[model samples]
Target: MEQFPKETVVESSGPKVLETAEEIQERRQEVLTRYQSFKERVAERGQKLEDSYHLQVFKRDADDLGKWIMEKVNILTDKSYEDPTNIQGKYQKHQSLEAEVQTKSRLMSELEKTREERFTMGHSAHEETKAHIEELRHLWDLLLELTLEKGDQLLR
Candidate 1:
């Protein structure tokens, strides 16, 4: 009439163990998700900057908009291939993005310097000139947004 205990008693508490296959699959998914998020953030930030730059340029000279956009496209495209994760690609996209940020920052600073130089030129300077300077400020804002976006994306 005595009941026999089971050979193995599974513990209901404590850490759960995952099989090797499951763990590997889970890690793979995590990496993939991270990479996808990185790409999306980069693309979104780039698009926003492009839009702001385009708008600013349009306000100054609509005809020059194409040239400005083309320049941006070229810079972004070059930086895309520079992603450090793509080691075999030889482009170093992450580095390229950093370099692009530096270049844009320097250019904006130079624009501000030039604006200050023009301030003493005359009292009757065109109002559009000030508008152009404001556009550069917006450009700098966009650049900062891009850098932060990229940083957050990579950290995730």
Candidate 2:
């Protein structure tokens, strides 16, 4: 048996289809470029997904608080103060409601904290979240005012 050189044996077996150095470099760079593009796309999608999650959570919490405030306002607007009997009990109930309103400060502060976080992140829902916060604050102020006003009138 005779031994042939490795390169000569390979060349004789078939046409030289092996890649050149530059072509190899170019293909490596193409792979790197595609990987970089994929990384960027994943980062962008992650950012958008987080933004959406924050927005939905904020909306849900805000809506729940708003509905709660509305129910309290309905109770405040009732004709209980007009009742000629049980004036003392009505006054006590009014005072209890006033205290209940104070309890919401913690929840409101939590919402504010969430808003500030979203603001720092420059979330896509910035404007919409701001509007929702303003609306909720307005409702809270209205409820507080009504509670005080009703208490004063009840005392009279």
Candidate 3:
């Protein structure tokens, strides 16, 4: 049997922390100006976020999975679209990612949860947060929908 290295999450962050977060506040508004400074502040705040043990693991695992999905989106070209004549670059791909993550959602009680609820990672606590998840998917969904039938329906 192949004994690959025992995996980093096991040795350090482990699994339990993967579910509960101290907090994950990701607000989005258009940053059409001074984007560089905004990015700088975001980076600094993200670094400080690492100090919280539970949330950091939760964040890191989601980052890997988020990376995985975006990786999937880039390759989905050609098979999905020679097409993305979109008002916003893509719509189909975005929808696709949403469907993918949405299918993985196992939480039966999001309405029961407070913002800082101690949720055990469902299928996705090694989970992608909603903001990034939709960001990746929405972009591609438009792309796919745009070309799937030719621009025949694009006008609507």
Candidate 4:
């Protein structure tokens, strides 16, 4: 029987070749090390991107959401006082505002949760993003307080 060279036989399989057990283990370790390094790099890059863009985006969205809620509040308050005789209509208006407030509040909560998750991922930008989100949350709380105060006056 004629014997072909091992190198020639190996090269015939193309560029992608499966490694033996020991080789596979060594490669696996190398790949894991590379992956960890990449994860760290990606996390840092993600954090920087969040600081530069996500924070501003979240602030704008939160502001818009707050404004929408306030508009609904105004509509409900105006309708309730403008037509005292139409009790059913006033009740419906209040109901609509209630639903809107709930929905917006849920959305805000989700945004907060997402922000927190990003924060916990331990990326380099996580701290800054977290701080920004906290500031926005505080702003939202202030608006909520004002809304409640105004709502109290309207109820009275």
Candidate 5:
């Protein structure tokens, strides 16, 4: 294993000067806070963009289509065929298929409902995050200004 090395510029310009540990640490936090927030914003944007790609699929008419087929099958099951054996096999297969369709349709309907709720929640979260970013930006402005002033005082 190797030890991690750290270096600092003793004094150069106001911003460049590596001052006290506290000063360096404070500035490091400022940069870190700003960068992490910027990264989150970009990540949210990218995630939303990627999610939109599947919007159409998730929003498909699976629920409605399944309902239609289910109803149609129910109506046909009432009739009987002249050749009982052949029709029985076909009837049995369709019975299972309609059952599957029923389940799938119900599932798709639930998925759409959940998706709708997500958009609603996402909108509220977006508003809150926007407000948060603004407040942080305001604080950053003040902190950086004060640091600049003190650096000038020290530099001279």
Candidate 6:
């Protein structure tokens, strides 16, 4: 939050209206109280804004992460018809792909850590977060199984 003035400054010019000191004091107190109230409101809203920002940030981060994982799944499942008989060569290519999958697994864990932190902070979208995590886990498991099965087929 930005800093607000510590005190409200009151100034009087040469052409000031004539008023008793008691009335002037009352007005000054009112101004001070009003400023304090405004400051509290600003502070409260700032926190709410910060919370909302994290909410959106987590949503997009999870979404893009899942999207990337889906892309990898698609790539792995693609049938290479250009050299259909090159079993060993295709196996080698797919074997090398394990490294990429491992990195994505690590990325998913990192996102999980972020999700736990957000949940601890009482952020929203809990259901969606859990669903995304579940889907990513399922997809990752499927990818690993496919990789293994494909390698076995190539060997045969």
The order by descending lDDT is 2, 6, 4, 1, 5, 3
TM-score of each: 0.36, 0.54, 0.26, 0.40, 0.27, 0.52
- Model 2 pairs whose backbones collide: none
**lDDT by residue (tens digit), candidate 3, 1-156:** 587776555556544544323332222223434577888889877654223454555455456555554555564545366655563444454456556545434221231132245355443642445555456456545544543543344335
- Model 3 gets an lDDT of 0.47
Best by TM-score: 2
Model 1, 31-62: lDDT tens digits are 99999999988987764322344334333443
- Residue pairs clashing in model 1 are 82-92, 82-93, 82-94, 83-93, 83-94
2 or 5, greater by TM-score:
2
Highest-lDDT candidate: 2
**30-73, model 4: which lDDT tens digit per residue?**
99999999999888776443444555656666676667756755
Worst 10 residues of 2 by lDDT: 47-56
Query: Which stretches of model 3 miss by more than 4 angstroms?
Result: 1-52, 78-100, 107-115, 118-156
Question: Model 1 Cα displacement at 108 (Å)?
Answer: 2.6
Model 3 scores worst on lDDT over the 10 consecutive residues at 106-115
**Candidate rank order under TM-score:** 2, 6, 4, 1, 5, 3
Worst-scoring 10-residue span by lDDT in model 4:
46-55
| lDDT by candidate, in order shown | 0.56, 0.74, 0.47, 0.65, 0.51, 0.71
Write down the worst ten-residue block by lDDT for model 5.
147-156
Q: Which residue segments of model 6 deviate by more than 4 Å? A: 1-57, 80-83, 119-124
The digit string of per-residue lDDT tens for model 2 on 1-156 reads: 398756546557678788989999999999999999999899877654335565566667788788768667667656645664776776887777666677677767777777875645566667777787788888888878877776787786
Backbone clash total for model 4 is: 0
